[PDB]
Design an enzyme around this catalytic site. Structure first.
Site, PDB file in Angstrom:
ATOM      1  N   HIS A 125       0.853  -1.129   0.025  1.00 33.18           N
ATOM      2  CA  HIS A 125      -0.049  -0.037  -0.155  1.00 33.18           C
ATOM      3  C   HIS A 125       1.020   1.202   0.252  1.00 33.18           C
ATOM      4  O   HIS A 125       0.813   2.267  -0.897  1.00 33.18           O
ATOM      5  CB  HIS A 125      -0.980  -0.037   1.197  1.00 33.18           C
ATOM      6  CG  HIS A 125      -1.963  -1.175   1.196  1.00 33.18           C
ATOM      7  ND1 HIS A 125      -2.747  -1.281   2.037  1.00 33.18           N
ATOM      8  CD2 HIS A 125      -2.333  -1.933   0.157  1.00 33.18           C
ATOM      9  CE1 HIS A 125      -3.572  -2.318   1.894  1.00 33.18           C
ATOM     10  NE2 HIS A 125      -3.358  -2.859   0.475  1.00 33.18           N
ATOM     11  N   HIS A 131      -9.131  -1.622  -5.601  1.00 33.84           N
ATOM     12  CA  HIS A 131      -7.959  -2.026  -4.442  1.00 33.84           C
ATOM     13  C   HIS A 131      -6.972  -3.117  -4.941  1.00 33.84           C
ATOM     14  O   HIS A 131      -5.928  -2.906  -4.697  1.00 33.84           O
ATOM     15  CB  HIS A 131      -8.655  -2.372  -3.034  1.00 33.84           C
ATOM     16  CG  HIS A 131      -7.534  -2.539  -2.111  1.00 33.84           C
ATOM     17  ND1 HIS A 131      -6.751  -1.458  -1.526  1.00 33.84           N
ATOM     18  CD2 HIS A 131      -6.679  -3.693  -2.044  1.00 33.84           C
ATOM     19  CE1 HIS A 131      -5.851  -2.034  -0.628  1.00 33.84           C
ATOM     20  NE2 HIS A 131      -5.763  -3.245  -1.045  1.00 33.84           N
ATOM     21  N   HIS A 147      -0.301 -11.448  -4.790  1.00 34.10           N
ATOM     22  CA  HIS A 147       1.013 -10.816  -4.721  1.00 34.10           C
ATOM     23  C   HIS A 147       1.845 -12.080  -5.207  1.00 34.10           C
ATOM     24  O   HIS A 147       3.138 -11.737  -5.617  1.00 34.10           O
ATOM     25  CB  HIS A 147       1.111 -10.254  -3.179  1.00 34.10           C
ATOM     26  CG  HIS A 147       1.075 -11.274  -2.226  1.00 34.10           C
ATOM     27  ND1 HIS A 147       1.849 -12.272  -1.687  1.00 34.10           N
ATOM     28  CD2 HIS A 147      -0.231 -11.424  -1.404  1.00 34.10           C
ATOM     29  CE1 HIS A 147       1.351 -13.030  -0.867  1.00 34.10           C
ATOM     30  NE2 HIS A 147       0.059 -12.640  -0.671  1.00 34.10           N
ATOM     31  N   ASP A 163      -2.972  -2.474  -5.112  1.00 37.59           N
ATOM     32  CA  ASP A 163      -1.652  -3.438  -4.659  1.00 37.59           C
ATOM     33  C   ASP A 163      -1.057  -3.525  -5.633  1.00 37.59           C
ATOM     34  O   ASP A 163       0.314  -3.788  -5.673  1.00 37.59           O
ATOM     35  CB  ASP A 163      -2.586  -4.932  -4.328  1.00 37.59           C
ATOM     36  CG  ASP A 163      -3.286  -5.159  -3.063  1.00 37.59           C
ATOM     37  OD1 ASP A 163      -3.038  -4.163  -1.962  1.00 37.59           O
ATOM     38  OD2 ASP A 163      -4.320  -5.706  -2.973  1.00 37.59           O
TER      39      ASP A 163
HETATM   40  C1  LIG Z   1     -15.243  -8.194  13.552  1.00 35.89           C
HETATM   41  O1  LIG Z   1     -14.537  -7.154  14.238  1.00 35.89           O
HETATM   42  C2  LIG Z   1     -13.280  -7.367  14.347  1.00 35.89           C
HETATM   43  C3  LIG Z   1     -12.980  -6.203  15.121  1.00 35.89           C
HETATM   44  O2  LIG Z   1     -11.627  -6.570  15.833  1.00 35.89           O
HETATM   45  C4  LIG Z   1     -12.142  -7.435  13.228  1.00 35.89           C
HETATM   46  C5  LIG Z   1     -11.367  -8.446  13.152  1.00 35.89           C
HETATM   47  C6  LIG Z   1     -10.563  -8.493  12.035  1.00 35.89           C
HETATM   48  C7  LIG Z   1     -10.880  -7.714  10.907  1.00 35.89           C
HETATM   49  C8  LIG Z   1     -10.041  -7.860   9.760  1.00 35.89           C
HETATM   50  C9  LIG Z   1      -9.275  -8.242   8.673  1.00 35.89           C
HETATM   51  C10 LIG Z   1      -8.868  -8.769   7.513  1.00 35.89           C
HETATM   52  C11 LIG Z   1      -7.910  -9.466   7.291  1.00 35.89           C
HETATM   53  C12 LIG Z   1      -7.449 -10.130   6.086  1.00 35.89           C
HETATM   54  C13 LIG Z   1      -7.556  -9.359   4.992  1.00 35.89           C
HETATM   55  C14 LIG Z   1      -6.934  -9.709   3.616  1.00 35.89           C
HETATM   56  O3  LIG Z   1      -6.048 -10.247   3.660  1.00 35.89           O
HETATM   57  N1  LIG Z   1      -7.773  -9.442   2.552  1.00 35.89           N
HETATM   58  C15 LIG Z   1      -7.418  -9.996   1.257  1.00 35.89           C
HETATM   59  C16 LIG Z   1      -8.119  -9.646   0.190  1.00 35.89           C
HETATM   60  C17 LIG Z   1      -8.093  -7.943  -0.153  1.00 35.89           C
HETATM   61  C18 LIG Z   1      -6.962  -8.134  -1.337  1.00 35.89           C
HETATM   62  N2  LIG Z   1      -5.658  -8.233  -0.707  1.00 35.89           N
HETATM   63  C19 LIG Z   1      -5.003  -7.092  -0.207  1.00 35.89           C
HETATM   64  O4  LIG Z   1      -5.541  -5.977   0.226  1.00 35.89           O
HETATM   65  C20 LIG Z   1      -3.576  -7.320  -0.057  1.00 35.89           C
HETATM   66  C21 LIG Z   1      -3.455  -8.095   1.560  1.00 35.89           C
HETATM   67  C22 LIG Z   1      -3.595  -6.968   2.514  1.00 35.89           C
HETATM   68  F1  LIG Z   1      -5.112  -7.174   2.673  1.00 35.89           F
HETATM   69  C23 LIG Z   1      -3.197  -5.956   1.972  1.00 35.89           C
HETATM   70  N3  LIG Z   1      -2.949  -5.930   0.518  1.00 35.89           N
HETATM   71  C24 LIG Z   1      -7.456  -9.297  -1.933  1.00 35.89           C
HETATM   72  N4  LIG Z   1      -8.022 -10.108  -1.007  1.00 35.89           N
HETATM   73  C25 LIG Z   1      -8.762 -11.421  -1.631  1.00 35.89           C
HETATM   74  O5  LIG Z   1      -8.167 -12.188  -2.284  1.00 35.89           O
HETATM   75  C26 LIG Z   1      -9.500 -11.966  -0.486  1.00 35.89           C
HETATM   76  C27 LIG Z   1     -10.460 -13.072  -0.713  1.00 35.89           C
HETATM   77  C28 LIG Z   1      -9.013 -13.370  -0.023  1.00 35.89           C
HETATM   78  C29 LIG Z   1      -8.471  -7.980   5.225  1.00 35.89           C
HETATM   79  C30 LIG Z   1      -9.037  -7.763   6.235  1.00 35.89           C
HETATM   80  C31 LIG Z   1     -11.905  -6.712  10.975  1.00 35.89           C
HETATM   81  C32 LIG Z   1     -12.760  -6.486  12.088  1.00 35.89           C
HETATM   82 ZN   LIG Z   2      -4.175  -4.432  -0.377  1.00 34.26          ZN
END
Ligand SMILES: CO[C@H](CO)c1ccc(C#Cc2ccc(C(=O)NC[C@H]3C[C@@H](NC(=O)[C@@H]4C[C@H](F)CN4)CN3C(=O)C3CC3)cc2)cc1
Ligand SMILES: [Zn+2]
EC number: 3.5.1.108
Length: 298
Positions: free
Chosen positions: A79, A236, A263, A240
């Protein structure tokens, strides 16, 4: 007059939480000299450990783009690296007090803002560009990622989740008409309840909240104030990808196409590209008036 490399005009200090670690982290961005690149520093360690933000230093993490040197790492760099690419920063030291870049609002917005509040400094040297000369592509099962010669810079992306919340799962940005700042930078990372629950149970996503992620149960966005863009999810993925492309160490002249890519496969593309020297050349522009890309005032 030539397209000149850029660094920071002044230091940037921010504070936040590792998405995965849940750790409070202090972040400093500093001016760096000509041909330095983006260099991450773990300043909590004695001695200090520095990892150039380059494909040679990517680790085999599953959750985000992670830089490694020995058993030292820096997690979730994509990011920030995306915000530096957006703004055309060649040179900058990125100091961290902990293993993970802070997540902020989940986007590159905060980082873009801090950087642009400090402003940038043109340096006395030609900015170097990586120009795609040939088609370079990679596949693994159903995921594809491709470079393609293009006079300019453009990123095109497709995702396909079988989920009620999909709205547009496709987008294409040419960064010589579309503004990265306005149209991509505020696009937040997203997560499904089912997935967030497993990661929590594995002691991951310790910093995640509606404050830094779009949270999606079975049917709907749970974030009380919804989405910033109709197409945020795929916007988004473009964020990435621009971040991951910058591990090349210079800005890109060419097109990127991702289909359900992440990634891992992005990293396979950079490796293959770097390896196939028939497919790319380093170029400078002595006359910016005739360059295929242009930059904001510093
Ligand atoms: C319920 O309330 C609680 C409050 O405490 C709570 C707890 C945890 C979270 C949270 C979170 C979270 C964890 C992991 C990721 C993530 O791994 N997303 C991956 C996404 C998104 C995108 N990748 C990215 O964006 C990359 C990897 C990182 F996200 C940064 N860059 C692509 N992608 C996919 O393919 C998804 C299908 C798997 C997201 C949120 C919330 C509340
Ligand atoms: Zn991301």
């Amino acid at each position: 007059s030539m397209i000149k490399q850029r660094t920071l005009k002044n230091i940037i200090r921010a504070t936040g939480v590792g998405l995965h670690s849940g750790e409070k982290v202090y972040l400093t961005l500093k001016p760096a000299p000509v041909d330095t690149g983006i260099v991450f520093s773990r300043t909590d360690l004695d001695p200090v450990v520095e990892i150039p933000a380059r494909a040679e230093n990517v680790g085999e993490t599953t959750m985000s783009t992670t830089l490694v040197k020995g058993d030292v790492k820096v997690d979730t760099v994509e990011h920030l690296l995306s915000a530096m690419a957006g703004l055309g920063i060649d040179n900058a030291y990125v100091e961290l007090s902990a293993s993970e870049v802070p997540i902020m609002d989940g986007s590159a917005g905060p980082f873009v803002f801090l950087i642009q509040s400090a402003g940038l400094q043109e340096q006395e040297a030609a900015k170097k560009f990586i120009r795609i000369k040939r088609e370079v592509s990679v596949e693994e099962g159903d995921k594809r990622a491709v470079f393609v010669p293009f006079d300019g810079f453009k990123v095109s992306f497709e995702i396909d989740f079988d989920h009620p919340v999909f709205r547009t799962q496709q987008a294409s940005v040419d960064f010589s008409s579309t503004s990265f700042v306005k149209e991509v930078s505020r696009a937040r990372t997203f997560g499904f309840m089912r997935d967030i629950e497993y990661l929590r149970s594995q002691n991951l996503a310790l910093g995640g909240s509606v404050e830094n992620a779009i949270v999606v149960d079975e049917n709907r966005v749970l974030n009380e104030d919804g989405l910033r863009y109709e197409d945020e999810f795929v916007k988004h993925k473009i964020l990435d990808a621009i971040g991951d492309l910058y591990l090349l160490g210079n800005s890109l002249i060419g097109e990127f196409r991702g289909f359900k890519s992440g990634h891992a496969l992005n990293n396979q593309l950079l490796r293959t590209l770097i390896a196939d020297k028939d497919a790319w050349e380093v170029v400078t522009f002595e006359d910016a008036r005739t360059a295929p890309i242009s930059y904001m005032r510093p």
